[PDB]
């Protein structure tokens, strides 16, 4: 059911696996993510950006997740604000029923980042909500101080290829769950699916699978995944548009799109190590 | 709020206007219908087919509607099962929170249609839910008996050019709200939008706007509207896919798709006479 972010990630931290954090913007994305978790027996970290929240309305973002939660009550799921930008934004998410919030203040100096993170932490912890923050390449010594002072629950350190030595140093010093941002891999089958549907990816490349695996071994426990899901989703939509010019049944477009998105999530759950962890 | 279908249609009945009954299959469709109703100050009839219920899950179908209703508490909204095909399906919609159900038994002989409709009515009225049934072209004396025996709240008479004389006789004999099925009126702007995006409608003919207006003057009060919405929506999706083969932000595909659907709903509400009726 709907649980504090730290419940899922403390366990990932202790046992040494990564929990994919999958963004959604509507019902179709959320359904395929949830079906993936059900089929892989995997905990679900559900993410909504400020943009997706404005699109849906926070009442709907939370409401739909709560419906999905009742549909699979055996799956632990956290509802997590991805890249909150202001304290007020984090407070609204907490009020709306999110069980995890990220405040991104990494563009500030250390002292200002720490003070804004600490403000969000106080508010969220008072309502029983976990907090993510961002630092950074990250200075591991200030990461150590940042975590001890802010009491944030998980940290996204800037490590990039990936600086795996820096990651192990941050992990050793902070002893908390760590988050990797922009962690989509853009797999070969998804890119081939998107190009077969006529799409163009501008030669964009993700983090290869072996580097995701190595970052989990380095101590990453939350793995932000968004871009992969969208490319796998829209490529089916583009395909359906191309092949039947008379097709306007939305289900005919989004049923295969859901299936491709679900498959990306399933595979990523297996890759990161959250498969069969319920 | 979520009200009995009869509550909305009894008012439409007494005042001689039509209320569009708009199908939905996911959040995007539902959001745009509601924004249309909010901007036209019109009551909302929201319809979900057995197919769309399967696609969403009846718990999500009702759950999303209940969230939207709290977002616009001032709007009268009925949640209606479109073309229910078994008693059991009607009973499931009633138990899940639908406030109106249609049992489609029009392929049966008069006696079996009446028997099945009556069984639905006893069940649905016990739970405070309104019932639609279907007959037919329609025999108006059959309609008069059917309505008086079944106590169904509204009836879809098969009247389709559309037989105005027959509609008026049915209206006179039954004196209940009447519903018009297959009443999408593929508007020129919408058709041009679909074709401009490379769509192919196969030369499908929609009901002329004047024939929708004449049915409302004849006593139609619920106008089933689906195809029009899906064409407008998918037209924008095809457009976004065409004009940027690197676009896979779902909001970029569906925000304009919502707006096009909303505009269809707004114009229909004005056409049928439900604008400014709250
Ligand atoms: Na985040
Ligand atoms: Na109906
Ligand atoms: Zn950032
Ligand atoms: Zn970041
Ligand atoms: Zn129909
Ligand atoms: Zn029909």
User: What DSSP string runs through B102-139?
Assistant: EE--TTS-HHHHHHHHHHHHHHHHHTT-EEEEEE----
**DSSP strand E in chain B: where?**
19-23, 44-49, 77-84, 100-103, 130-135, 154-157, 178-180, 220-225
User: What is d(CA B264, CA B220) in angstroms, rounded to the nearest whole number?
Assistant: 19
The structure tokens listed for B46 are: 């929201």
| Residues with Cβ within 8 Å of residue A36, at least 6 apart in sequence | A42, A262, A263, A265, A266, A269
User: What is d(CA B89, CA B101) in angstroms, rounded to the nearest whole number?
Assistant: 9
CB B34 within 8 A of CB B44: yes
Catalytic residue among A59, A82, A196, A200: A82
CB contact under 8 A, A237 and B241: yes
CB A201 within 8 A of CB A240: no
- 3-state class of A133 per DSSP? strand
The structure tokens listed for A163 are: 């600086």
Q: Which residues pair with B155 in a beta bridge?
A: B133, B178
B78 is in which domain, residue-wise? 1-278
- Cα angle A157, A161, A162 (rounded to 5 degrees) comes to 35
**DSSP strand E in chain A: where?**
19-23, 44-49, 77-84, 100-103, 130-135, 154-157, 178-180, 220-225
Q: Which residues pair with B2 in a beta bridge?
A: B77
User: What is d(CA A33, CA A40) in angstroms, rounded to the nearest whole number?
Assistant: 11
Burial of B143 (0-12, 13-18, 19+ CB in 10 A): buried
User: What is d(CA A227, CA A185) in angstroms, rounded to the nearest whole number?
Assistant: 8
| Ligand number with the minimum distance to the CA of A80 | 1
Residue B208 DSSP class: P
Nearest to A8 by CA among A122, A130, A116: A130
The structure tokens listed for B36 are: 């249309």
Q: Name residue, tokens 């730290």.
A: A6
User: What is d(CA A91, CA A124) in angstroms, rounded to the nearest whole number?
Assistant: 7
DSSP count for chain B of H helices, then E strands: 12, 8
Chain B: closest CA distance from residue A249 (Å): 7
User: What is d(CA B10, CA B153) in angstroms, rounded to the nearest whole number?
Assistant: 9
User: What is d(CA B90, CA B98) in angstroms, rounded to the nearest whole number?
Assistant: 9
User: What is d(CA A40, CA B53) in angstroms, rounded to the nearest whole number?
Assistant: 25
CB B150 within 8 A of CB B138: no
CB B124 within 8 A of CB B156: no
Cα(B48) to centroid(ligand 2), Å: 9
User: What is d(CA A118, CA A245) in angstroms, rounded to the nearest whole number?
Assistant: 54
CB contact under 8 A, A63 and B59: no
CB B206 within 8 A of CB B162: no
| Ligand number with the minimum distance to the CA of A182 | 4
User: What is d(CA B85, CA B120) in angstroms, rounded to the nearest whole number?
Assistant: 11
Nearest to B174 by CA among B195, B197, B200, B153: B153
The structure's method of determination equals X-ray
Burial of A168 (0-12, 13-18, 19+ CB in 10 A): middle
CB B184 within 8 A of CB B233: no
Is A188 in the active site? no
How far are the Cα atoms of B14, B19, B27, B276 from residue B8, in angstroms, in the given order? 10, 8, 23, 14
Nearest to A135 by CA among A124, A122, A125, A148: A148
User: Quick one: how far is CA A258 from the chain centroid?
Assistant: 18
User: What is d(CA A158, CA A31) in angstroms, rounded to the nearest whole number?
Assistant: 31
Total domain count, chain A: 1
Nearest to B83 by CA among B56, B111, B60, B53: B53
Nearest to A89 by CA among A58, A62, A65: A58
User: Quick one: how far is CA B152 from the chain centroid?
Assistant: 17
The structure tokens listed for B54 are: 């399967």
Catalytic sites of B, residue numbers: 82
Other Cβ atoms within 10 Å of A163 Cβ, number? 18
Handedness of CA A255, A276, A82, A73 (dihedral sign): positive
How far are the Cα atoms of A190, A239, B164 from residue A196, in angstroms, in the given order? 10, 8, 52
User: Quick one: how far is CA A162 from the chain centroid?
Assistant: 18
CB A1 within 8 A of CB A77: yes
Q: Name residue, tokens 């968004």.
A: A226
Here the CATH number for the domain that contains residue B102 is 3.20.20.70
Q: Name residue, tokens 């200002």.
A: A112
φ/ψ of residue A49, rounded to 5? -75, 165
Task: Find the CB nearest A63 among B67, B201, B251.
Answer: B67
Residue B2 DSSP class: B
Q: Name residue, tokens 């931290």.
A: A13
Q: Helix, strand, coil shares of chain B as percentages rounded to 5?
A: 55, 15, 30
User: What is d(CA A181, CA A160) in angstroms, rounded to the nearest whole number?
Assistant: 9
Long-range own/partner contacts, residues B159-163 (CB < 8 A, 24 or more apart) = B159/B215, B160/B207, B161/B211, B162/B207, B162/B211, B162/B214, B162/B215, B163/B137
User: Quick one: how far is CA A124 from the chain centroid?
Assistant: 19
Task: Find the CB nearest B26 among A28, A52, A194.
Answer: A28
Q: Determine if residue A72 is left, alpha or beta; phi over 0 gives left, psi from -120 to 50 gives alpha, anything else beta.
A: beta
The structure tokens listed for A12 are: 């990932």
The structure tokens listed for B26 are: 């996911």
The structure tokens listed for A78 are: 């956290």
Task: Find the CB nearest B67 among A25, A59, A70.
Answer: A59
| Residues with Cβ within 8 Å of residue B113, at least 6 apart in sequence | B105, B106, B133, B134, B135, B146
User: What is d(CA A163, CA A220) in angstroms, rounded to the nearest whole number?
Assistant: 12
CB contact under 8 A, A251 and B51: yes
Nearest to B217 by CA among B13, B42, B16: B16
């Amino acid at each position: 059911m709907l649980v504090k972010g730290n419940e899922i990630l403390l366990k990932a931290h202790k046992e040494g696996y990564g929990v994919g954090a999958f963004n959604f913007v509507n019902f179709e994305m959320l359904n395929a993510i949830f079906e993936a978790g059900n089929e892989e027996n995997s905990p679900l970290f559900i993410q909504a950006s400020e943009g997706a929240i404005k699109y849906m309305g926070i009442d709907m973002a939370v409401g739909m997740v709560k419906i999905m939660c009742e549909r699979y009550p055996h799956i632990p799921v956290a509802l997590h604000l991805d890249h909150g930008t202001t304290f007020e934004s984090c407070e609204k998410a907490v009020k709306a029923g999110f069980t995890s919030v990220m405040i991104d203040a990494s563009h500030h100096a250390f002292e200002e980042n720490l003070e804004l993170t600490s403000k969000v932490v106080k508010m969220a912890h008072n309502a029983g909500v976990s907090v993510e923050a961002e630092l950074g390449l990250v200075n591991p010594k200030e990461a150590e101080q940042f975590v001890k002072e802010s009491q944030v629950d998980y940290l996204a350190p800037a490590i990039g290829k990936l600086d795996f030595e820096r990651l192990q140093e941050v992990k050793r010093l902070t002893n908390i769950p760590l988050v990797l941002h922009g962690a989509s891999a853009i797999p070969d089958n998804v890119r081939k699916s998107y190009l077969d549907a006529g799409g163009d990816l501008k030669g964009s490349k993700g983090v290869p699978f072996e580097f995701l695996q190595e970052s989990v071994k380095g101590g990453i426990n939350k793995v932000n995944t968004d871009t992969d899901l969208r490319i796998a989703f829209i490529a089916e939509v583009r395909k359906v548009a191309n092949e039947d010019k008379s097709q306007f049944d939305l289900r005919k477009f989004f049923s295969p799109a859901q299936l491709a998105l679900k498959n990306v999530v399933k595979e990523r759950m297996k890759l990161l190590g959250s498969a069969n962890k319920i």
